Design a protein around this ligand. Structure first.
Ligand code: D5M
Ligand code: D5M
Lengths: 520, 520, 123
C-alpha cells in the first residue's frame, strides 16, 4: 500500500453484522502517539529500599503499542446483549489489523505559544512480534486499550517489560530487548500497515448456567440400589443396646447421603468481606489476612483464584476478599476510592459446580476411631485436583479481558486465564509503533558525543480491527422463559451506556454472560 | 391413508425449530368428542322477553369443530420469548392439519355402573369449509381451542351460528345451513384425515415500539424556516397598545408550535377507570356510560375500539372502560370475578402514534372570532379518518387471537381485526367433525316415525397442526441495550408458566410483543 | 422526481490558530473528513421538517452545513428505558483527503405527479 499526501490511505469501518452462525465486528478509532522516553531506552528498577515484595527490574522503551484485549473494544452494548441472550457459547476466529491516515506533527515552543505544524517527510515505525520473541505484556488488564465509545480518541500506551531480579538488583540471566533490532515497516503520510491473524482452537466460552446442581442430579422419585451406613450406635435404645452396624438404602429422602459420581471443582479459600463497613473486624487486614502465594521468597496476592462462587444463597452482600474482578466507575481516583465508586462482579451462576470462595470446602477424617478413640473431623480449606472433579470457569464481562498468552513452560493444568477468557499458546501478536527520531541542528564541527538534540513531534492516525467470532447456538427444550438481560423500562435520569450532559461515555454496570440455561 | 385396527394412523409431532428466516411450529393434542344435540339440528333464539339488545336467532348443530386461533396453541413460552426479543415482525405462511389414531367408544348404563367399550365398526365424519359457504364462527375469541399445555386433553367445541333476526323472531332472508349437505370423509379406526393450507399476503405484525414520537420528530438543534402567528394582542403593553399581528419563526424552543407533517391515528374516546375501587364514581355505569354503537336499533358495546393508548405518562393505574383485552386467570368464575382474578393488558408502546383512549383527541375551532366575538374552543372526543394520519395496531399476546376472517362486504377500511392479529379474506377454513349416528334396536314392524333410538357413544383421537412462520429480522443501530422480556431471577414460589402441586398449568401474565425498538 | 446524483469534491481542510490577537489560517493537507449515507434508514430522519441549512437559492451564495441532532422518546424532561442512542462513528464511512471525492446515486419511488393545475369546474 503506497499512495500520496492528499489521498487517504484507508476508510472508517466501524460496524457489526450477524450471520446466525458467526458474527463479524469491525472497530475503528483515532489514536495519538507522543515521543516516549525521549527516544531513549532506560533501565528501571525498584526504589532503594522502598518495598520488598514489589522489588523488580526491567527496561523502558521509546516504543508504543496497540491493545484491544477488552470486549467493549469490539461489541457495542446492544450487540453484547444479542450475543449474551441467544448463544450457548462463542469464540474468536480471525483478525484483520490496519493502520492508516497517518499524520506526523512537529511542535515548537517559540515564546509563550505552541505552534503545531506538518512534518510531511517524517516517518513512523511499525512491526508485529509474530515469533513471540518479545515479552508478552498484554493480557495483564493494563490501560490504553481502544475506547469503548467509537467517538473517543485515545493515547497509545508505552512499552515496558520486566526481567529476572534479585531484589532491586538483576541476575546474569536477565534479558535486554532492543526493538530497533527488529525489522519494521517505516511509514510516511499516505503509507499504511496491514496485518491478518488466525486464532487457534480454543473451547467456546460458557454463555450459560446449569439448570441442575452437582448434588441434585438423580431421580427424585426412585430409590437407589446401593446401601450406606447411617447408624453406628443409635439403635432400639432401651435395654442392653450400646451399639450396632445398620445400613440404609439410598432414597429421595436421604438426598445428601446417596452414592455420588462426581466432585465439585478445586478451591483456595478466600476471606469473607461485607459491603456494610460495620459487619467487619475493626482491623486493616487486606494483606495479613488475605490469600496469597510466594515465589522465590516474594509474597504475591492470589487476586482472582480458582473459579469459586462469590456468596451462598440468601446473602448477596458478602464478597470474597478480592476473590473476583472489580471495575472502576468513570472518573474515580486510582488511590483508595469509595465502595460507591467501584463495580464488583457477582459469580453466582457457578454455584452448581464450584465451592463458595469464602466458605470451607468439605470434611476430611484424620484418625482411627475405636472404642478408645473418638472420631475426629478436620475442615478442609484448600483442595488440589481430584479424579472425578468437574467445574466451570470465570465469566467474561463486556469490559473484561478477552485472551491471554499461555506461558511457555514444561507444564500447565487448565490453561484458562484466571482473570477469565481465552488462553492461547500463540495469541494475537504485539503491534509496536513509534515515531522515528528526527535530529535537530547539527554542529558544523564533528562531534562523536551521543546525539541528544531532537525535534519534538508526535503522530496521529486511525486504527482498524476486524474480528470474526464463531457462535454456539442455543438448543434448549426448556418450556418456561429464561432470564434475559434488559434495560429498565422505568422513567430514568440518564440512559444506560451513554454520553452525559458534557459528553462523557459511561458504562453503568458490569455485564456477565451466563443468562441462558443448559443442563448438566 | 388407509390402515388397520392394530396399526396407528399417525405419530406425535410436537416440536419447533428455527431457521433464522422462519420458524416452524408443530403441535399435537388429544381430543374427545361427545354427541351434541343428540344428533339433532335445533332452532335456537332469545328468551321470550328476557333482553332486547341481546335478541338473536340461529341454529344448533350436532357437529363439533377444531380451533387453534390462539398463539399459545403453537408457541411454547420459551419460543414466544425467542420470537418477541429478536424480530421486527412476523406472519403466518403455511399450514398442515392432521387427524389420526381415532377411537370410537360406546357407553352403556346397565344398572348403576357405566361400562365403556370399543365400537370398531363405527365411523366419524370430517370436512373443511374451504369455499367458506358456512358462517365463520372462529376469530370471536370463543373457548375450546388447543390447550396451551401439550399434556392437557381437551373437549371439542360444538358448532352453532347466528342468522338475521327481528327481535326473537326471524326474517325471510334468514339462512339455514345443514352440514350433512356437505361432502365429508368418513373415518373408521385406522383411517386418518389430511389437510394443507396456504396463508395470503398479510403484513408483518409490529413486534416493535417506536423510539421517537410523532411530535418529537425534528432536529432539536436547528430552527425551521417557516413562521407561525403566536401573538394576537400581547405587545409592548404600555401606551396605545391594544393589539397587533406578530409572527415567530419556529425554534427547538417552540417545539409544540412548529409546522407539522403528520397526524396521530383516529380515536373513539373511552371512559376512564381506576383499579382502586374508590377513585371511581359510586354508580354502576359499565353500560350507561360506556362507548357503544347501534345497528338496526340494537346497542352493541364497542369493546376493543380503534388502537388507542391505555394511559398517559406517570399513571399506569387508569385503564380504559373495556378499551383493551382482558384475560381470566386459571380457575375464575365466568360471572363477576374480582379484579385480582383477571389480567388486564397495557397498550403503552403505541403512545407515540396513537391518542390516549380515555383522554380527549384535540381542539377544534367553531366560530368566527372578531372584536365583537370571543374565539370559541371545542374539545373533540371523536375523530374519523384524515389524510396525513398514521397509526399503530393492537398488540398480540401469547394467548391472544391469531387471525380473523374479513367480512365479505362492499367496503372495508383497515381490515386488521380489532381484537388484534391478521385479517384474512380467506382464513384457515373450519374443520367440522362429528360421530356418525348409530341406530339402536329397530322394531320388527315398520315404523315411519322419525328414528330417535340411538346408541350413545363418543370419539377420541389425536390432532396435529403445523404452521410455518416468516420472520422479519432485527436491524438496529441502537447503541444501548434494548428492553427484553425475562423471568424473575429472584427466589420464587412457583415457576412461571408451569404446572403446580396438583398438576394444573397456569400462565402468570399476558405477554406483549413490542420489546424491540425501531425509528419512525 | 426520478433520479438523483450526489457529489462532494474539491475538499480543503483548514486549521486555525489564535497565537496572540491575530488568527492565522493554514492548510492541513494530511487531514481527512468523513462522509456516509443512511441508506438503510437506521438513523432518525431529521429532514422534511422545514429546518434551515439547505442549499442557497442563489448559486453564488456560500452556506454553512447544519449540525445533526435527534429526539427520542421522553417522559417530561426525563427519558424512558426504550430510548435509543445512536452513534454515527458506528457506521462505515468513507474518509477523504484533499483530492479525494464522494459519489452517490439514488432512484425515487413511484409517487403521484403533483397537481400543477386548478379545476375549471366545481364539485
Ligand atoms: N482457554 C483455554 N485454552 C486452551 N485450552 C483450554 C482453555 N480452557 C480450557 N482448556 C482445556 C481444553 C483441553 O481439553 C485442555 C488442554 O490442556 P493442555 O494443557 O493443552 O493439554 O485444556
Ligand atoms: N390484517 C390485515 N389484512 C389485510 N390488510 C391489512 C391488514 N392490516 C393492515 N392492512 C392494510 C394493508 C394494505 O395496505 C391495506 C389494504 O386494504 P384493502 O381494503 O384490502 O384495499 O390494508
Amino acid at each position: 500500500g503506497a499512495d500520496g499526501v492528499g489521498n487517504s490511505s484507508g476508510n472508517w469501518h466501524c460496524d457489526s453484522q450477524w450471520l446466525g452462525d458467526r458474527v463479524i465486528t469491525t472497530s475503528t478509532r483515532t489514536w495519538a502517539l507522543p515521543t516516549y522516553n525521549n527516544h531513549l531506552y532506560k533501565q528501571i528498577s525498584s526504589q532503594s529500599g522502598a518495598s520488598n515484595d514489589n522489588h523488580y527490574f526491567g527496561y523502558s522503551t521509546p516504543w508504543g503499542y496497540f491493545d484491544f484485549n477488552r470486549f467493549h473494544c469490539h461489541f457495542s452494548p446492544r450487540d453484547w446483549q444479542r450475543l449474551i441472550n441467544n448463544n450457548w457459547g462463542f469464540r474468536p476466529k480471525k483478525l484483520s489489523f490496519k493502520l492508516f491516515n497517518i499524520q506526523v506533527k512537529e511542535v515548537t515552543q517559540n515564546d509563550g505559544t505552541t505552534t503545531i505544524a506538518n512534518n510531511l517527510t517524517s516517518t513512523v515505525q511499525v512491526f508485529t512480534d509474530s515469533e513471540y520473541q518479545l515479552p508478552y505484556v498484554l493480557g495483564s488488564a493494563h490501560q490504553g486499550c481502544l475506547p469503548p465509545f467509537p467517538a473517543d480518541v485515545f493515547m497509545v500506551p508505552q512499552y515496558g517489560y520486566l526481567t529476572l531480579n534479585n531484589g532491586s538488583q538483576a541476575v546474569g540471566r536477565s534479558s535486554f530487548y532492543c526493538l530497533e533490532y527488529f525489522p519494521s515497516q517505516m511509514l510516511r503520510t499516505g503509507n499504511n500497515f496491514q496485518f491478518s491473524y488466525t486464532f487457534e482452537d480454543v473451547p467456546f466460552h460458557s454463555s450459560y448456567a446449569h439448570s441442575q446442581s452437582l448434588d441434585r442430579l438423580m431421580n427424585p422419585l426412585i430409590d437407589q440400589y446401593l446401601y450406606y451406613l447411617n447408624r453406628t450406635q443409635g439403635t432400639t435404645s432401651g435395654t442392653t443396646n450400646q451399639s450396632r452396624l445398620l445400613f440404609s438404602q439410598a432414597g429421595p429422602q436421604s438426598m445428601s447421603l446417596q452414592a455420588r459420581n462426581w466432585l465439585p471443582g478445586p478451591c483456595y479459600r478466600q476471606q469473607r468481606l461485607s459491603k456494610t463497613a460495620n459487619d467487619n473486624n475493626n482491623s486493616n487486614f487486606p494483606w495479613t489476612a488475605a490469600s496469597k502465594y510466594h515465589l522465590n521468597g516474594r509474597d504475591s496476592l492470589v487476586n482472582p483464584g480458582p473459579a469459586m462462587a462469590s456468596h451462598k444463597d440468601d446473602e448477596e452482600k458478602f464478597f470474597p476478599m478480592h476473590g473476583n474482578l472489580i471495575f472502576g466507575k468513570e472518573g474515580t481516583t486510582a488511590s483508595n476510592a469509595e465502595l460507591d465508586n467501584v463495580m464488583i462482579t457477582d459469580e453466582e451462576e457457578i454455584r452448581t459446580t464450584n465451592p463458595v470462595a469464602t466458605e470451607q470446602y468439605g470434611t476430611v477424617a484424620n484418625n482411627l476411631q475405636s472404642s478408645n478413640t473418638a472420631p475426629t473431623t478436620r475442615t478442609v480449606n484448600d483442595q488440589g485436583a481430584l479424579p472425578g472433579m468437574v467445574w466451570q470457569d470465570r465469566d467474561v464481562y463486556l469490559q473484561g479481558p478477552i485472551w491471554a498468552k499461555i506461558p511457555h513452560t514444561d507444564g500447565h493444568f487448565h490453561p484458562s486465564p484466571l482473570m477469565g477468557g481465552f488462553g492461547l499458546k500463540h495469541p494475537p501478536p504485539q503491534i509496536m509503533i513509534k515515531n522515528t527520531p528526527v535530529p535537530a541542528n547539527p554542529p558544523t564541527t564533528f562531534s562523536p558525543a551521543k546525539f541528544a538534540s531532537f525535534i519534538t513531534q508526535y503522530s496521529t492516525g486511525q486504527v482498524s480491527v476486524e474480528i470474526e467470532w464463531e457462535l454456539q447456538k442455543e438448543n434448549s427444550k426448556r418450556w418456561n422463559p429464561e432470564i434475559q438481560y434488559t434495560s429498565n423500562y422505568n422513567k430514568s435520569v440518564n440512559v444506560d451506556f451513554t454520553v452525559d450532559t458534557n459528553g462523557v461515555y459511561s458504562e453503568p454496570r458490569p455485564i456477565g454472560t451466563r443468562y441462558l440455561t443448559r443442563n448438566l
